[PDB]
Ligand binder design. Structure first.
Ligand code: HEM
Ligand code: HEM
Ligand code: HEM
Ligand code: HEM
Ligand code: 5PK
Ligand code: 5PK
Ligand code: 5PK
Ligand code: 5PK
Lengths: 331, 328, 326, 344
């Protein structure tokens, strides 16, 4: 009912135990170390709570405009929380390496993941397991149950406009590309400067390779096997269609949903980068007790594209054609 | 020892109880409401922990350069935490007023014990559960940062009459400077510009009278316009004059950070009152009128700023050439 | 065509003239003073360009969903620029008061900025080419006026159609009647009395919007700015913000409040910087009138969309809100 | 004297020319594109002005506490400007790719570097530039005039902040053999510390823990060999793994060891701000490449392939970080009790 009881502050504010104080050698900054991590864990619980509710709203055949608005609200809220978590790094960087060295003896390393909740966030978003008892159950369920990556793909596959009997976007798009590149060739052929004519013709050939990568499903499949793409061919067609008509009321919220998924992915990378810089400022690439630089090198490897979930969304503008060449909406 | 046990996550992650879920009318955003407030409370505990350690380092006759550097580090850390707490407001503003309305029935009407402890430990004026009562009493009786900073400022080397005797040299330089301004204003060809400069010199005379006459300073303190003792104000003025000097750079950074903290608390108060109005307007069903909203608006006044004196210091400044040069 | 020519850098990067350097007494921080102000003026030109395009899109009888989306994009863009301009204040605060004192003799007293005044007038703040710009910004419709005209044409308010306002008064009457009966059966006498006094406060709140004479009196007094019908439209939008048809109109109102709030945050940060630099008064200021004027700009008399900030005062729970028909 | 004349607004506010408006096909967002870039260029001029003044204060034999404080103020000011410049990227991301596509035809690619001032900042800090030189539709000059070529040449030949900071670090009081003689006391403390670790590891009851600690002490030995053997340090500098001279690194290490001491607190803050500047430039590069990809993907019509996007991604490597040596300093740290106590 009242503030302190409602928020269970007697339990929350009783979870801070400084081991350097227990051992009669107190390091003042150990309190900061505990609070910073606990604030991260409170916000990780919030992100998991948001992610699970979004996963449940996406696990349905019909996703209406009303539910789409609520998914956008929750994804945007996760973006704000992640921005706040990135800003928590300079607060811990205020602790000197020598002060950290005076209490790191009371800390034990991890045999698997560092944080249970951080791993649950990674798995629920769609971070690849191959591209790397209640707690074991949580990890198993996060690996077996559909991730946001998979659920977003199912939603994109059912994008209205892709059906052959209806708007038939994909065929109209290949048709428009052919006419657009034909017009570019004719315009390039009339270039008075020979150098500019040759450059434009080579550039039109680069566009042809780009369109082959999406219009030939076998080329798309090879990129998925290679790890360059993750989306199914139909999820990519839906995602491309959404970027083309983002100005249209019917596609603005679906587009904002995709934009926010990219923002979340990008903010997780920014957290990883800020964390690895803080780690290096505290203990360098290796220190006494670390057994070499394997911990630091592992953190650096998490900065690769193998860890980005919605890599496909970042490249969508490669396939764009100008407004005048885009197939006009019928309905 | 390991992560989860060291951070006591079994206790920390078991303090979130949604009352709308318990009553089987769940409001999804109630979880955000709990987590946002709990993150504030964790950082309030950190600020109190920092403030108590700074208060202890300041409760000493000698405050050396090494301890000054550590106080500056901890005050700067509090500034970073306050900036993060101001940024937590837009996250809660993401909850709609209608969603909040669906769970506010489970909430009952100081608001936060730790927030009040921060106010008292910093020096927010009282005139302007047994463990909780004890904490409030100790925060009111024990010296606040406002009082301890004043004691530190009073012992500023350079103020003593036997040594550098800054205050007397400063009154002497002001007289010399204002005399030169008068002579320059007397040679102004345009009568209107001469009269403007002469009226302006007269306003400077009143400004300096407010600090060079201790009775005028005392009256301003009684009125609530100033908080500092006359000697703490002399020390603070001296520090701003020589901030570029190595000897005064860290004492100046200490004052700057106290102002930053004061300013950030006001920014939190403003962002909180805007969020409150976005959620329930000036009054709503269950508020009993607009008294709560009006109280929050009154916390935005200068009566709630602790180091009001520090913000006005530049009013007393004279140019570099007129400042008494350091001897030693 | 190429970068430097396209951006006219030969002209842009030749507009920094340090007067302390010209007089052979250089103050290094004078360069920062010039660049900071010039960055503000570049962004003020961008905000005016955005505001003028939004004013033109709002000066139309029909404002469809497609145009509403574009207005939201530009308003959100202005919010991001204002946040950036608030962050430019600590950069200038890095200059010391003594360094500023060494070059402020080359500065003249003076509105301060033409573009800042144009932004205030184009938004709707109630305070020869430059004089013409000021006159046109005062005579031509401000965003405050154009948003009111848009709110007045909110679909749902017409008596022949959805008739929101009448259904809303009807729902309020039934809701407050139910609250009275519930309060009458409160077992604790203290809680019964508190709830009854609280319902009376709600009655006064609803009288302020359901009686047009009470609304008109609040507008004359300065407590409100909106016409009665603009306020009905704004209230309706906040009630149905979860509905796809009202989400973008609501986001438009939200962004107007954000802009208003960010201008106040800039004013507050500017007045703190001013006090850090020259206190409440200094040599050349002729007293504290300049500082007191800046402090008065922090009042609600300077907020344009004050009406939008109070809208949640009129809210009733989801179950009591008239359901959408169409 | 008055606002508009002092700031030369008649000249400043007359530099915005939308080419889509000139061609009678106006794209509203083209105005944003011009202003954003012009705000970057104004702040680049400010950073260059700050960097040149810091370079001049560092190009002296004696750098006193008063000047050290002023250098710290200007480096900190640059950090605030860089943070503001990173925040300018989301403002331009507000322009849709299709709107950008409607005016990119009026833009020409560039012969060499994109911005003269951004290159001057890189060179003045100490960035080691790669190679580039790309084929374009129509050729253009790398330098607009001999004054721009001269600026680039002077920024490459004249001492960068990287070089001047090294000279300052080389003269760190405490390194001289006749005085505090830090380096010898430090090697001596490391020898005793590692000897104590060996004896403690030898008494480990569990064999697995004993072998882990002994293998870990061997890794520490290699770490200390990389700084106590000048030939190993020299090899790392030739390889590109380090940039600092051996004596500059000794001074930087000494400063991190005694950062709590008043005499070393401002020299340490100076190093910290150099790392912050380096880190913020990388953050700008990352945010810029994400915006580029959101606008035109990895390649688009007019780009001639993905070489431009791949070049920008290559600027995110450690080869572009200037003060890489400063980021690793904590690798060499020993506990407080093992650090040689200050004498004087
Ligand atoms: C003094 C500051 C810190 C130090 C020295 C530090 C150190 C490290 C190291 C060495 C690792 C790699 C372990 C290994 O696999 O060998 C790691 C991983 C990790 N740390 Fe930190 N850390 C610090 C602060 C933080 C904070 C504030 C958080 C926030 C919750 C955090 C969360 C994590 C997580 C979640 C991982 C796993 C990363 C992944 O698997 O991709 N650390 N940390
Ligand atoms: C849904 C959002 C919120 C609403 C509606 C709200 C509402 C209110 C109201 C009405 C009061 C005044 C009570 C009275 O004296 O009559 C108040 C005070 C207060 N609230 Fe909130 N609040 C919200 C979020 C927060 C958050 C996120 C915090 C952070 C800890 C917070 C901390 C406080 C504190 C510390 C006070 C006391 C202020 C002072 O005495 O100066 N509130 N709030
Ligand atoms: C060293 C820093 C600054 C000082 C000392 C300063 C001082 C002042 C003073 C004293 C006034 C009031 C003049 C009067 O009416 O008597 C004023 C107004 C104003 N200043 Fe500043 N200022 C500073 C920086 C800035 C910056 C960075 C900007 C950005 C463009 C700015 C923009 C303005 C504007 C637009 C007004 C008019 C405010 C209004 O009418 O509401 N100032 N300033
Ligand atoms: C619509 C947004 C933008 C697009 C599409 C874009 C695109 C590009 C591309 C393709 C390159 C590489 C050129 C090549 O070497 O082949 C580049 C480089 C560069 N751009 Fe942008 N850019 C954008 C905005 C900006 C902004 C806002 C700035 C700020 C001044 C900027 C500054 C630069 C600089 C300095 C480089 C050179 C980077 C380096 O050499 O490391 N760009 N940009
Ligand atoms: O202000 C209090 C609620 C109180 C509170 C209770 C539980 C958790 C957090 C908070 C809170 C935060 N700020 C004020 N309050 C009001 C909020 C409006 C409805 C009646 C109770
Ligand atoms: O394993 C801990 C780090 C671990 C940790 C333990 C306890 C509480 C928090 C954390 C933490 C946060 N990020 C990594 N870790 C070691 C990792 C090697 C350097 C010294 C700390
Ligand atoms: O009137 C000027 C301030 C004015 C100004 C002049 C020239 C360039 C920029 C500015 C400025 C910015 N904000 C207020 N002003 C003040 C600045 C010092 C104290 C009394 C005169
Ligand atoms: O190389 C220029 C982009 C270059 C540029 C030119 C003119 C003005 C600004 C800019 C700019 C900003 N960042 C990169 N560039 C090309 C790159 C994409 C196709 C058409 C513009």
């Amino acid at each position: 009912k009242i503030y302190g009881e409602y928020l269970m502050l007697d339990k929350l504010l009783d979870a801070q135990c400084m081991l350097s104080e227990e051992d009669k050698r107190p390091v003042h900054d150990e309190h900061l170390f505990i609070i910073t991590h606990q604030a991260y864990e409170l916000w990780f619980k919030q992100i998991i709570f948001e992610f699970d509710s979004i996963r449940d709203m996406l696990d349905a055949e019909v996703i209406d405009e009303t539910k789409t608005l609520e998914i956008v609200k929750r994804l945007n809220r996760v973006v704000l929380i992640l921005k706040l978590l990135v800003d928590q790094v300079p607060i811990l960087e205020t602790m000197t390496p020598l002060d950290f060295m005076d209490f790191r003896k009371y800390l034990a390393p991890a045999s698997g993941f560092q944080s249970l909740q951080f791993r649950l966030i990674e798995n629920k978003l769609g971070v690849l397991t191959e591209q790397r008892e209640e707690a074991r159950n949580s990890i198993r369920n996060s690996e077996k149950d559909p991730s946001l990556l998979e659920l977003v793909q199912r939603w994109l596959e059912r994008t209205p406009g892709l059906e052959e009997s209806g708007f038939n976007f994909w065929a109209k798009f290949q048709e428009s590309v052919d006419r657009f590149l034909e017009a570019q060739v004719q315009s390039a052929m009339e270039e008075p400067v020979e150098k500019a004519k040759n450059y434009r013709l080579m550039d039109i050939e680069k566009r042809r390779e780009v369109y082959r990568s999406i219009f030939d499903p076998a080329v798309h499949d090879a990129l998925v096997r290679r790890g360059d793409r993750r989306f199914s061919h139909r999820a990519l067609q839906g995602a491309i269609m959404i970027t083309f008509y983002r100005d249209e009321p019917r596609f603005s919220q679906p587009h904002q949903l995709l934009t926010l998924l990219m923002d979340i992915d990008s903010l997780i990378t920014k957290w990883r980068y800020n964390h690895v810089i803080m780690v290096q400022r505290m203990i360098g690439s290796q220190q006494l007790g670390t057994g070499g630089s394997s911990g630091y090198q592992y953190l650096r490897s998490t900065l690769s594209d193998r860890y980005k979930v919605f890599l496909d969304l970042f490249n969508l503008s490669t396939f764009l054609i100008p407004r005048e060449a885009i197939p006009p909406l019928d309905e």
